[PDB]
């Protein structure tokens, strides 16, 4: 099982040091002491009421004071009153009065102890935020704020405004507890399995000395592809280009059918003249051994084998390129003047560079980019990824065995909840109903008919519009029998998991119960062969599951590629295995307009996709034109075949672009035919227990608070007291993630204010246990501080 590690750019001390430790301990004592004296007072009220009845005033006033939790008036608690009560009751009253008085004074002292401690933490915030890796990441994400931080460091006692401090504190928390990449807020590398025996200590992982991250600076893919298209349309760069037939081109004995430019990718049908028809035909003999076409040698070839007329052999080619039937691509990116500077600036090794020089440098790079192709609605012209070249850690295979076995079971079982399963069922039903059980429909004709149905109005497309059209599932009352079965299968899965006791905030499912449930499932629930499972270890052998996506090296291939670029030598990422016989896996060719889809090529064959040429031999290309769609008799689902080769073809998206960034036909291939899934995280407070399947935490414990339950600042630090009283009374822990999720540490005065503001005018607030807790970060060798980490484990 291949494993990578993502780790936070700041250590856990960075957020621990921002906690008002003294004040908070005092807040928790007050809260607990208030709740105890309240309860005890009502109990002593009862006891006192009972003494009053044994005896056949004063006592009635003492009683009312205890009941309602106020200090008895001087007339209500006296030696004569205490003498008339039993010793134990009088001693319990005395203790209550004493503790109530002590509570009252400590209430008085708190606001200035808290105000002073919070003020001290402002400078600790600056201290933590001085870290160079952090300042670099903030410089990219938020340059003005980062310029302001740099000034503060240069001018301390230049107390920045609260709202800057809150924004800084949020980014600090993000860089200490959130594991998704951003820049030098995190770093990623590979992990290895260290063969057993050397784990006497009980550790599950062992870290190498922290390597300083290397950073890769990359341009926005959509900027890159707009700029590239601009350059390819200039007549002088035709000699700098190669051409190829759009691999969605279908000749229909009359017309050309094909797909056009991304991102809109129109479905195009145009009339052929006999000249255009021979032009397309001679493109086959005009091509290299790998399908590329010399533009000059083709322009002469057309000129001799039609009539000549070079002036117009050129306007003919030009019009075919403009139309998108013939594709123009560069000869290597351009080695042209403007492209070599961008390429040099992107590659510029940033060694020895402070945050300000970095901001200036990026600013200049941005300008040359705009003075080349407009930014437009592109948000973020540049991104950075931080990686390390050597293994970050070794993993203990015997500590991890039960957890990974449990995870595999979970991984299979979650398949029933896949959002693409309704899609598959509806697409399959469409195929049966329009074309017939044994139909074999050209992929492109099928894509077109589906889009015709979605854009239009006919009840024949009702389900396609409901499940495949824009807008995100009403299943049990659906027309199709399998959709109602699915709903039933989901409800059974859900009720199996939740039909069990909450002991200590945990519902525990045994993996065998899920294996039993799964053996009953029908064949149209198909379970991916591999998943990328993002997990965090937690105490007592737990693994906490965050995200599941497809895995056939999906994210890992991108990591291998980025490390390869930093090291100057490729990582041999193993290939996907074509099996069983008669079946191949094929990723979509090229990068489909995204820098996040550039990777170590993982499959043998590839789906050759319109304007995204890949990296493979001719005999290994499966053009869109060669795909067909059929109903599989095993599952009753729609599958793809190669017309040319007869194989089942399973499309793979192995790049890290999100599915909505895929152009339309590609998106359709992934959603309808891909074999991955995606897992992502009334009137009172409602508690949901944590759900575990053996060792795997599938759902963290949660607390749902409607609008009106939550204390609102009506107030200074008396606010934190009331908040903590409500959280304690509802079992809500000190540290939690609130709903993207915000990290809430009630001891952190910045994060409390960030929380105050973020829940303004919300209908609900969702608290989730912090698990693992940051303080549960696995210790380190030497001077390296504990950090929060997450593992990408590929399970297969």
Automatic annotation (TrEMBL):
Domain Lantibiotic dehydratase N-terminal, first and last residues per copy: 130-326, 577-738
InterPro entries, alphabetically? Lant_deHydtase_N
Q: What is this protein called?
A: Lantibiotic dehydratase domain protein
Q: Which organism is it from?
A: Thermobispora bispora (strain ATCC 19993 / DSM 43833 / CBS 139.67 / JCM 10125 / KCTC 9307 / NBRC 14880 / R51)
């Amino acid at each position: 099982p291949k494993v990578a590690v993502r780790e936070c750019g700041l250590p856990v001390s960075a957020i621990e040091s921002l906690c008002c430790t003294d004040s908070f301990a005092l807040i928790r004592r007050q809260v607990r002491e208030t709740a105890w004296l309240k309860g005890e007072g009502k109990r002593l009220a009862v006891d006192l009421g009972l003494l009053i009845g044994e005896r056949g005033p004063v006592l009635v006033g003492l009683r009312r004071a205890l009941h309602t939790g106020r200090l008895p008036d001087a007339r209500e608690w006296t030696p004569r009153v205490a003498s008339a009560l039993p010793a134990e009751l009088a001693a319990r009253v005395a203790d209550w009065v004493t503790r109530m008085r002590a509570l009252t004074r400590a209430r008085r002292e708190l606001p200035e102890l808290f105000a002073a401690e919070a003020r001290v933490k402002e400078k600790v915030l600056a201290q933590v935020a001085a870290d160079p890796g952090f300042r670099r990441a903030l410089s990219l994400a938020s340059p003005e704020l980062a310029a302001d931080l740099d000034r503060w460091l240069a001018e301390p006692a230049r107390r920045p405004k609260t709202q800057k401090l809150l924004r800084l504190a949020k980014y600090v928390a993000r860089a200490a507890v959130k594991t998704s990449p951003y820049s030098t807020f995190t770093s990623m590398g590979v992990a290895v399995w260290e063969n057993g025996e050397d784990w006497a200590d009980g550790a599950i992982v062992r870290f190498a000395p922290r390597e300083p991250p290397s950073v890769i600076l990359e341009p926005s893919g959509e900027w890159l592809h707009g700029a590239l298209r601009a350059w390819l349309a200039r007549p002088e760069n035709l000699v700098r280009s190669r051409l190829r037939l759009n691999p969605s081109l279908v000749i229909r004995a009359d017309k050309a059918e094909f797909l056009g430019f991304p991102p809109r990718e129109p479905i195009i049908r145009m009339g052929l003249t006999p000249v255009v028809a021979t032009v397309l035909r001679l493109a086959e003999p005009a091509a290299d051994a790998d399908g590329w076409i010399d533009p000059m040698g083709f322009r002469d070839r057309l000129a001799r084998d039609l009539p000549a007329e070079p002036e117009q052999v050129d306007r003919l080619l030009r019009s075919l390129i403009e139309a998108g039937v013939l594709e123009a691509h560069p000869l290597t990116l351009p080695e042209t003047g403007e492209w070599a500077e961008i390429r040099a600036a992107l590659r510029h090794d940033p060694h020895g560079e402070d945050p300000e020089a970095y901001r200036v440098r990026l600013a200049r790079l941005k300008r040359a980019m705009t003075m080349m192709w407009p930014q437009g609605d592109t948000t973020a012209l540049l991104h950075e990824t931080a990686v390390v070249t050597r293994p970050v850690a070794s993993l203990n295979p015997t500590a991890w065995g039960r957890g990974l076995s449990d995870l595999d079971v979970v991984r299979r079982w979650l398949s029933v909840f896949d959002g693409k399963l309704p899609i598959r069922i509806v697409v399959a039903e469409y195929l049966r109903a329009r074309y017939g059980e044994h139909a074999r429909v050209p992929f492109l004709t099928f894509h077109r008919h589906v889009q015709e149905e979605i854009a239009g109005d006919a009840p024949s497309g009702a389900d396609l519009r409901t499940f495949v059209g824009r807008s995100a599932p009403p299943l049990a009352h659906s027309r199709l029998p399998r959709l109602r079965e699915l709903a039933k299968l989901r409800e059974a899965a859900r009720e199996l998991a939740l039909g069990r006791p909450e002991h200590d905030g945990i519902q525990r499912v045994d993996p065998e119960e899920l294996i039993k449930q799964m053996a009953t499932w029908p064949e149209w629930i198909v379970v991916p062969r591999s998943c990328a499972c993002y997990v965090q270890p937690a105490p007592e052998g737990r693994l906490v599951l965050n995200v599941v996506h497809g895995g056939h090296g999906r994210g890992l291939r991108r990591l291998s590629h980025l490390i390869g670029r930093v090291r100057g030598e490729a990582v041999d990422h193993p290939m996907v295995a074509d099996e069983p016989e008669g079946t191949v896996y094929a990723e979509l060719s090229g990068s489909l307009g995204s820098t996040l889809n550039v990777h170590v090529p993982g499959t043998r064959y590839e789906i050759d996709y319109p304007f995204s040429p890949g990296d493979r031999s001719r005999d290994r290309r499966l053009p869109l034109s060669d795909l067909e769609v059929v109903l599989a008799p095993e599952t009753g689902l729609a599958e793809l075949r190669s017309r040319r080769l007869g194989f089942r073809v399973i499309p793979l998206h192995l790049g890290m672009a999100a599915e909505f960034q895929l152009p339309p036909a590609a998106r359709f291939l992934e959603r309808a035919f891909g074999v991955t899934y995606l897992l992502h995280p009334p009137q009172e407070v409602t508690r949901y227990p944590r759900v575990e399947v053996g060792r795997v935490v599938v759902q963290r414990r949660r607390w749902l608070a409607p609008a009106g339950t939550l204390p609102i600042r009506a107030d200074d630090a008396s606010y934190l007291l009331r908040l903590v009283a409500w959280t304690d009374a509802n079992g809500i822990p000190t540290r939690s993630f609130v709903r993207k999720p915000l990290f809430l540490d009630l001891a952190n005065p910045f994060l409390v204010k960030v929380f105050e503001r973020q829940i303004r005018d919300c209908a609900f607030v969702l608290f989730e246990e912090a698990l693992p807790d940051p303080a549960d970060a696995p210790p380190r060798e030497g001077s390296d501080l504990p950090r929060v980490i997450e593992f990408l484990v590929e399970l297969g």
